Each structure stands twice: as structure tokens, then as C-alpha cells.
Amino acid sequence: MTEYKLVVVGAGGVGKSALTIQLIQNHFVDEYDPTIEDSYRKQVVIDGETCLLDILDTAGQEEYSAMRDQYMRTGEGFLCVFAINNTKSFEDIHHYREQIKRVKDSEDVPMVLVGNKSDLPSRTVDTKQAQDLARSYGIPFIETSAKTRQGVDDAFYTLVREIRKHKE
Numbered sequence: 001m002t003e004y005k006l007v008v009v010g011a012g013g014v015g016k017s018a019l020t021i022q023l024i025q026n027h028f029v030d031e032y033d034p035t036i037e038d039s040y041r042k043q044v045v046i047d048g049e050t051c052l053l054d055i056l057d058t059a060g061q062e063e064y065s066a067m068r069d070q071y072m073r074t075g076e077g078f079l080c081v082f083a084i085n086n087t088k089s090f091e092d093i094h095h096y097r098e099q100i101k102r103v104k105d106s107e108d109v110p111m112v113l114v115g116n117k118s119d120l121p122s123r124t125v126d127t128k129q130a131q132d133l134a135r136s137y138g139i140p141f142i143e144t145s146a147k148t149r150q151g152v153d154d155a156f157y158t159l160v161r162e163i164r165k166h167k168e
């Protein structure tokens with residue numbers, strides 16, 4: 001079956017681990033060591049076809065590591081995550097997108113902008129702001145909650161579909 005290599009990037013605290021663990025293991029985890037980088041694996045059916053997802057969940061201290069570099073070079077698509085209640089994490093999005101463009105040496109990189117923690121009412125980033133940013137990057141914007149599962153499959157499977165079209 002076809003395999004897809006996905007990488008979840010964004011500032012610490014935005015919910016990368018929670019989004020990934022929710023997708024892979026179907027549980028919301030409120031206390032996951034922010035310093036753990038790990039790859040996760042799941043067999044899923046997307047548009048009728050069984051796929052294997054391999055997902056790197058990133059920790060900040062590994063950002064410039066050689067081993068991170070190898071995963072980024074081979075990564076086929078990227079979720080750029082911020083939290084809708086944290087303006088700083090939204091401000092940081094360009095940093096992650098820039099790193100991806102550089103490592104892939106490409107303007108044609110499958111990516112989705114993810115606004116996580118949509119269940120929280122203390123919003124500080126507007127959907128219109130993120131949609132504008134996503135449009136400027138040529139990518140979709142998907143709202144998620146790792147807590148309620150809102151949008152979680154949609155974010156990952158949208159990225160997969162983008163990789164699939166990029167390859168095929």
C-alpha cells in the first residue's frame with residue numbers, strides 16, 4: 001500500500017503531539033513531554049485506498065539537528081500548526097514555512113496551515129487572518145481541536161491528498 005511521510009511543525013505548546021496522538025491513537029493527551037520528538041505510524045483508508053501514514057511530531061530542541069534535517073528532506077508534506085488562542089504561535093508560522101521551503105529547496109511543497117485549540121473560547125487569532133496567511137502561502141487552512149477531534153482527520157488527510165496529487 002502507498003506510504004506517506006508527514007511532518008508536524010510549529011511552536012511548542014500548539015498541540016502537535018496532541019493532534020498526532022489523537023490521529024494515531026484516538027486519545028487526547030493533555031500531558032505529553034514537550035521535549036519528545038517521535039515518529040508515529042497508522043494504517044488508514046483515504047478515498048477508498050489503504051494508506052500508511054508515517055508522522056513526525058517535532059520537539060523544539062531538535063529543530064536544527066542533523067537527524068531532523070534527514071526527516072525534513074524526506075518528509076513529503078507538512079502541517080504548520082499554531083494555536084488559535086496564542087498569537088505568538090501564529091506569528092511564528094512564517095519561520096516554519098521558511099524552513100520547509102529551504103530544506104525541500106522547493107516552492108511546490110504539500111502543506112496545510114492548522115489552527116489548533118478551536119475548542120477554546122479565548123481566541124486571539126481570527127480565521128480571516130489565518131485564511132489570508134494560508135492564501136499567501138498557496139495552501140489550505142484547517143481548524144482543529146485535538147481535544148474534540150474537530151478537523152483532525154481533515155487536516156492530515158487533506159495533506160495526504162496534496163501529496164497524492166503532487167506525486168500522481
Ligand SMILES: Nc1nc2c(ncn2[C@@H]2O[C@H](COP(=O)(O)OP(=O)(O)O)[C@@H](O)[C@H]2O)c(=O)[nH]1
Pocket residue numbers: 010011012013014015016017018019029030031032033034116117118119120144145146147148
Ligand atoms: N484545549 C485544547 N488543548 C489542547 C489542544 N491541543 C493541545 N492542547 C493542550 O496544549 C498543551 C500542549 O499540547 P502539546 O500537544 O504538548 O503541544 P506540542 O508542544 O505542540 O506538542 C497540552 O496541555 C495539550 O493538552 C486542543 O486542541 N485543545
Ligand SMILES: *S(=O)(=O)c1cccc(S(=O)(=O)Nc2ccncc2)c1
Pocket residue numbers: 005006007039040054055056070071072074075076
Ligand atoms: S526514523 O527512525 O528514521 C523513522 C521512523 C519511522 C518512519 C520513518 S520514515 O517513514 O522512513 N521517514 C519519515 C520522514 C518524515 N516524516 C515521517 C517519517 C523514519
Ligand SMILES: [Mg+2]
Pocket residue numbers: 016017018032033034035036057058059
Ligand atoms: Mg509535543
